[PDB]
Amino acid sequence: RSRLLEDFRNQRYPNLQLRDLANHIVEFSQDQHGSRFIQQKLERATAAEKQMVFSEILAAAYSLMTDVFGNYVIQKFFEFGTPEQKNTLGMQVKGHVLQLALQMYGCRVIQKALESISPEQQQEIVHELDGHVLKCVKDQNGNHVVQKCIECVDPVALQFIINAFKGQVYSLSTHPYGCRVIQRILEHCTAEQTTPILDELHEHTEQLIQDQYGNYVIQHVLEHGKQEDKSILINSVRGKVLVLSQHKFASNVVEKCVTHATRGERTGLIDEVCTFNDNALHVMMKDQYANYVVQKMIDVSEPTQLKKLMTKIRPHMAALRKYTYGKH
Amino acid sequence: SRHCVFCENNNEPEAVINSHSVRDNFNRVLCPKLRTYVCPICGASGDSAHTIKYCPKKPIITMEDAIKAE
RNA sequence: AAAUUGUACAUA
Ligand SMILES: [Zn+2]
Ligand SMILES: [Zn+2]
């Protein structure tokens, strides 16, 4: 360290002001207490000192953004600065957005920028990252950025990603990070962008529900998509309710299936689980996952199915009392 | 959490309930009542002991299996 | 008597 950072890491300047940080902000932003101080005292005074801090760091931006503490600095600037500074920062960032998005703190900052900059520069960054869709969605950091873009940009500009997904919607709806990207896609797009991806999903529906991540995709379509898609998925389960209420992942899909449904779908599935060969009811009330399906069935049915069900498995109650289930 | 759920839902006396936890800081099994039990399905005992409903080999039951069992 | 009820979402 130099002199001033050894003077302030011991805290010897209780009345410090931005102007007092001259010629040491590159070292202050690399220290915790210094990045907190610069961060918290950049809302008062005039913009002259803020212009100073902007100038002393515009020379080390490519490192302060890939810095564990400088990234809060760059963030706060992208949030509070005059648009001239927004553009002046925005400029030198292009040419390395691949690397800066692969790196942790740089991608935190990238996210922080997309909610305050201009739409035009935004689309500049969009056209920056074409094609690499593969290596970017399949990353611990690229996927968060991708999500923030799905939240903040115009869908039609992003439509190229809708074309980089065909042939891959399966191997990505089953991907630990891709599935979030797919949920963001379905919750933030147009009809003509969700349509091909939704068909791609309706292809591999079977293997998707028994996957520990695709079932979040299904669950997301069941409580947010159009009624039509809901019915389309609801029918591709009739015949397997017992086999799936026993599955650890698919059981949640069953719950969120009986919740959102029409009277004909609810009554249809209730009828399917009414024709179970006695001991399969025992599998239901007994098995560690099915009983959740049972209860979410008890809570959302119409009173006709209610009184035609409180009796249907009323004997097995006696075999359920020694568990944790207190059902009146 | 300063008490064992298993011994509580099994209605063991309150002293036993608050005398141990179910599992471990290492995520083994700690409750002696549950450590004594040998799984009739997978034989596992003690450190990985578990009851039948939660056994990792409790087989998936189809419809045709529910028909054969009659 | 075998009883505990169930899966994701990142920086000091
Ligand atoms: Zn115990
Ligand atoms: Zn076992």
Residue numbers in the entry:
A (entry chain A): 1092 to 1419
B (entry chain B): 316 to 385
What does the article say, verbatim?
We determined a 3.7 Å crystal structure that reveals the molecular architecture of the Nos-Pum-RNA ternary complex. We crystalized Pum and Nos with a hb NRE2 RNA, 5´-AAAUUGUACAUAAGCC (the core PRE sequence is underlined, and we designate the first U of the core PRE as position +1 and number the four upstream nucleotides as −1 to −4). Strikingly, the structure illustrates how the Nos tandem ZFs envelop the RNA bases immediately upstream of the PRE and, together with the C-terminal region, embrace both the RNA and Pum. Comparison of the ternary and binary complexes reveals that the addition of Nos and the upstream nucleotides induces localized conformational changes in Pum that promote Nos-Pum interaction and binding of Pum to RNA upstream of the core PRE site. Loop residues between repeats R7 and R8 rearrange in the ternary complex to promote interaction of F1367Pum with the C-terminal α helix of Nos. In addition, the C-terminal α helix of Pum (helix α2 of repeat R8´) unfolds to promote interaction of residues with the upstream RNA backbone. The protein-protein interactions observed between Nos and Pum are focused between the C-terminal end of Nos (I376Nos to E385Nos) and the non-RNA-binding convex surface of Pum in repeats R7 and R8. For example, the side chain of Q1337Pum is within hydrogen bonding distance of main chain N and O atoms of I376Nos. The crystal structure of the Nos-Pum-hb RNA complex reveals that Nos binds to three nucleotides upstream of the core PRE when it joins the ternary complex, and we find that repression activity is highly sensitive to mutation of the interface. The first base upstream of the PRE, -1U, is inserted into a hydrophobic binding pocket formed by F321Nos, T366Nos, and Y369Nos. The O4 atom of −1U is near the main chain N atom of T366Nos.
Pum is a founding member of the Pum/fem-3 mRNA-binding factor (FBF), or PUF family, of eukaryotic RBPs. Pum binds with high affinity to specific sequences in target mRNAs and represses protein expression and enhances mRNA degradation. Regulation of hb mRNA by Pum relies on the spatial distribution of Nos, a tandem CCHC Zn finger (ZF) RBP. Here, we report the crystal structures of Nos-Pum-RNA complexes, which reveal that Nos acts as a molecular clamp that embraces both Pum and RNA.
